[PDB]
Structure formats: C-alpha cells, structure tokens
Design a protein around this ligand. Sequence first.
Ligand code: YW7
Length: 127
Amino acid sequence: HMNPPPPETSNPNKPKRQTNQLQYLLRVVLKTLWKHQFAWPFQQPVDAVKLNLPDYYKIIKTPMDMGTIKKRLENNYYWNAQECIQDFNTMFTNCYIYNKPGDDIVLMAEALEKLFLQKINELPTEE
Ligand SMILES: Cc1noc(C)c1-c1cc(C(N)=O)c2c3ccc(C(C)(C)O)cc3n([C@H](c3ccccc3)C3CCOCC3)c2c1
C-alpha cells in the first residue's frame, strides 16, 4: 500500500482576496493550534505507510491536516473563511471516524477541537 499525494494547496487559476477573517484564521487560529501540546500528529498528512495502516486511505477519502491548511491560507486558496473552517472540521471528523473513541489520538483531536471552537467563537466581523 502507498500514501496518496497530499491535498492540493495552490491553484493560480483561483481568484485571490485578503480578508480580516482569512488573516485571523492564519495568524491566530492556525498559529494557536500549531503550538498546542497535542498538535504534532495533525501538522502533516497521516503517514499510513510509516504507521502500517493499509485501511486508513480506504476509509478516509477526504484527508486533511494543518500543514495543508497553513499552505492553503498562505497561497490564498480559500475565497471565504467557511472553506477553511470546513477543512479544520474535516481533519477532526476524520480522526473520529477512523479511530476508536477514547484512544489517545481522539483525546488529542478533542483538545485541539475545543481550542479551535474557542477561536472560531472569536472570529472577527467581516470588514
Ligand atoms: C492525526 C491522526 N488522525 O488519525 C491518525 C491515525 C492520526 C495520526 C497521524 C500521524 C501522522 N501525521 O503520521 C501519526 C503519527 C506519526 C508518527 C508516529 C511515531 C512513529 C512517532 O510513533 C506516531 C503517529 N500516530 C499515532 C497513531 C498511530 C497509529 C494509529 C493511531 C495513532 C499517535 C500519535 C500521537 O499519540 C497517539 C498515537 C499518528 C496518528
């Protein structure tokens, strides 16, 4: 079994705009989650080959990780903040679907999600 290529993070055909919400998602949300004590497994795609998980990419068809989110924000890949919020939600839901409730990785994802939800509640109004 092989890992798939990582998610796309740049498309120069996609229109680009800088908004206070997108700036907040990179400088505040992504930065805060990146620095969390439990963030390291979420900083790059699930390495199914290294971890010998041949079923991971049979179950998870929409993989997502924070390394991908960081690059999509830097590349102005998202036109609206909701597309970015969806990617974080996909990353958390993937972890919950693949792993058993109560497993260490799930507890780590739940701690990151609690922090994420706190920062999203503080999402600034569109300027
Ligand atoms: C995120 C995420 N969501 O679902 C999974 C599935 C993951 C996910 C993603 C990755 C990754 N980015 O490659 C890694 C990862 C990378 C390297 C290592 C080494 C070789 C240093 O030991 C262990 C790793 N685990 C463990 C695991 C290994 C196998 C099964 C479950 C957990 C976790 C690590 C945190 O402490 C609880 C155990 C990962 C879990």
